[PDB]
Nucleic acid binder design. Structure first.
Ligand SMILES: [Zn+2]
Ligand SMILES: [Zn+2]
Ligand SMILES: [Zn+2]
Ligand SMILES: [Zn+2]
Ligand SMILES: [Zn+2]
Length: 113
DNA sequence: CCCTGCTGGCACC
DNA sequence: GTGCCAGCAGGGG
């Protein structure tokens, strides 16, 4: 990684990667949504914007361990890691003595009180 | 450079 | 308290 950034410690082997990184410092947003004229730093981010808001018949992602539906697959990963990650020694209920080894089931029981 | 997944601020009303 | 959102960089090539 010979290409070194001038304003921070980021470095890369490709010129495209540094040109893209420089947008974080310059605040440049060269991509614009042709419907609401919203600006974005990267083109892939713009495609996700058009899909999630302006595109009809979108296929969201359903969680396998509960009934929550999520629009983005990456946000489903956050859900799985945050809500359904196993807890070796479960956390006690705030009200009663019930114990749960997954965060989602713990909150759903506390809301039942 | 397109595709992909991760990150943290922030509506939620 | 968490999904939504744009920001963001790595991988492959
Ligand atoms: Zn930099
Ligand atoms: Zn738009
Ligand atoms: Zn779930
Ligand atoms: Zn309880
Ligand atoms: Zn479980």
């Amino acid at each position: 990684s010979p290409f070194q950034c001038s304003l921070c410690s980021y470095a890369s082997r490709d010129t495209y990667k540094l040109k893209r990184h420089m947008r974080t410092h310059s605040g440049e947003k060269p991509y614009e949504c042709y419907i609401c004229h919203a600006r974005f730093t990267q083109s892939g981010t713009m495609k996700m914007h058009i899909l999630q808001k302006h595109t009809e018949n979108v296929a969201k992602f359903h969680c396998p361990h509960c009934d929550t539906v999520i629009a983005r697959k990456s946000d489903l990963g956050v859900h799985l890691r945050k809500q359904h990650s196993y807890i070796e020694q479960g956390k006690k209920c705030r009200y009663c003595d019930a114990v749960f080894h997954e965060r989602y089931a713990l909150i759903q029981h506390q809301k039942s009180h």
